[PDB]
Design a protein around this ligand. Structure first.
Ligand code: FAD
Ligand code: JHY
Length: 455
């Protein structure tokens, strides 16, 4: 009875935790709304590609699924900023090619995980959606496509059913989750760059391409077949304040959109063949930041990944964080004296990191779109670089702590704040680098940042 678990959502987090527990003797039963994606090709995912960073890779590593995943992965050395008039600038993400990110297919990743879970001994049941949960009677309801319902008893319930969690609705009715929604004004549209067009325009095959435009932007991620998947991040509607400013409301036709592209991303528009067809057929996606005070009901049920912390995609960490979570949950469930202790402990350890990543993902928007290279900002950053060379065990860029390290998200954010505070005060009333005493600044770095180890 002790090693029974019912997981809702055969997505990314759900399938990893299904594999991690099943392989350790657990009686895992996974329920998926969708039909089996490695047989039937159903609905469009929230995105085609994903940026696989250390946290995610490492989780897949423990699962012994990392190699299979990286088999069809496209390396991403740094970001390729495209600003008209200025030649494309490549800013590397890290030191060498050891510090990279990977462009992997969502469905491929999902399918690899599904195989992994089923291999470990998990029972995956597709075409079954969670309709409701009776926590008091320790039962739940599922439904097939036809409407026919199915009532199953449960011992422990894991809500790994994504953004619009049926498990979260279920919990919210019997307990105050302490939800706090924060609506993202941007929407998104996925558009394609053919393998022929990517070759013709000699686009860097191993980089994360970005077209910044302040309140709106575009990104491109590489595909194994040399093609690219462009995403447009643009407001849903223009404000009453500025009603002439672009939005998805203004682009009523694929032609209106082709005009906006030739007008605002002119170097991009010719690479985008089928812009009109892709704009009309592929729908406008929604974004949000949902924060809950509570992720669990006693030892009975818990939310993991997107189900517990929906976030904006601007740091490309959502799935990384969701895989990191699955590890933590599996470890707590295996170590704790009982499920109430496990869920209490899991939530208590992940909730603060979940918040910091949500915060940092919002902050990253600005960083890649609204950047604004201020004279004092460029100065701060140069002093920051010196401080990183002089103090590698203390001064680490937040992107590096987030993306390449496995330091808890909240610690990465905390350190970042100490660093940004040092830089601001050090530059203060200085025009250039020659004015500041580097040795004095370095002493402060040692006084405010305790060292970090890879051991
Ligand atoms: C455009 C975009 C790009 C992104 N890019 C990145 C990136 O580069 N890197 C990154 O780390 N993150 C990225 N993210 C975030 C990432 O998509 C998510 O964080 C991640 O998919 C969450 O995984 P999950 O397992 O919790 O849920 P999901 O992967 O969303 O899986 C949930 C599963 O639950 C199922 N389900 C739902 N309701 C029910 C129900 N009632 N009953 C049964 N099954 C149900 C669904 O069918 C699905 O299989 C991106 C997000 C967006 C919006
Ligand atoms: O700061 C940067 O250069 C980009 C951040 N980023 C990432 O690493 O993977 C991502 C994936 C997506 Cl979908 C987005 Cl919007 C940003 C990122």
């Amino acid at each position: 009875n002790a090693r029974q678990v019912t997981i809702i959502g055969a997505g990314l987090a759900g399938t990893l935790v299904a594999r991690l527990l099943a392989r350790n003797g657990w009686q895992v039963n996974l329920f998926e709304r969708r039909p089996d994606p490695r047989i039937e090709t159903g609905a469009r995912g929230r995105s085609i590609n994903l940026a696989l960073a250390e946290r995610g890779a490492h989780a897949l590593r423990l699962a012994g699924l990392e190699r299979e995943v990286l088999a069809e992965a496209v390396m991403m050395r740094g970001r390729m900023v495209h600003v008209p008039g200025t030649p494309p600038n490549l800013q590397p993400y890290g030191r060498d090619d050891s510090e990279v990110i990977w462009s992997i297919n969502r469905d491929r990743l999902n399918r690899i995980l599904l195989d992994g879970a089923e291999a470990a001994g998990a029972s995956i049941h597709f075409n079954l959606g969670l309709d409701s949960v009776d926590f008091a009677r320790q039962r739940l309801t599922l439904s097939n496509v036809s409407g026919e319902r199915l009532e199953k008893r449960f011992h422990l319930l894991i809500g790994a059913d994504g953004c619009n969690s049926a498990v979260r609705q279920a919990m919210a009715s019997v307990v105050d989750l302490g939800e706090h929604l924060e609506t993202q004004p941007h929407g998104y549209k996925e558009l394609q760059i053919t393998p022929e067009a990517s070759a013709q325009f000699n686009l860097e095959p191993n980089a994360l391409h970005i077209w910044p435009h302040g309140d709106y932007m575009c990104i491109a991620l590489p595909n194994l077949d040399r093609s690219f998947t462009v995403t447009l991040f643009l407001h849903h509607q223009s404000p009453a304040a500025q009603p002439a400013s672009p939005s998805f409301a203004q682009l009523v036709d694929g032609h209106a959109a082709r005009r906006f592209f030739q007008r605002q991303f002119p170097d991009l528009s010719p690479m985008l063949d089928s812009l009109e067809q892709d704009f009309e057929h592929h729908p406008t996606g929604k974004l949000a930041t949902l924060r809950l005070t509570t992720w669990h009901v006693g030892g009975q049920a818990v939310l993991l990944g997107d189900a517990a912390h929906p976030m904006v995609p601007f740091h490309g960490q959502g799935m990384n964080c969701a895989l990191e979570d699955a590890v933590a949950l599996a470890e707590h469930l295996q170590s704790a004296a009982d499920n109430a202790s496990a869920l209490a402990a899991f939530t208590a350890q992940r909730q603060p990191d979940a918040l910091a990543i949500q915060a940092m993902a919002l902050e990253n928007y600005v960083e890649m779109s609204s950047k604004v290279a201020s004279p004092t900002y460029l100065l701060e950053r140069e002093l920051g670089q010196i401080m990183a060379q002089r103090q590698p065990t203390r001064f680490i860029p937040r992107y590096s702590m987030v993306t390449f390290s496995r330091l808890p998200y909240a610690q990465a954010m905390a350190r970042g704040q100490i660093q940004e505070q040092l830089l601001k005060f050090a530059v203060a009333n200085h025009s250039d680098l020659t004015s500041i005493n580097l040795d004095a600044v370095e002493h402060e770095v040692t006084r405010c940042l305790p060292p970090l180890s890879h051991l």
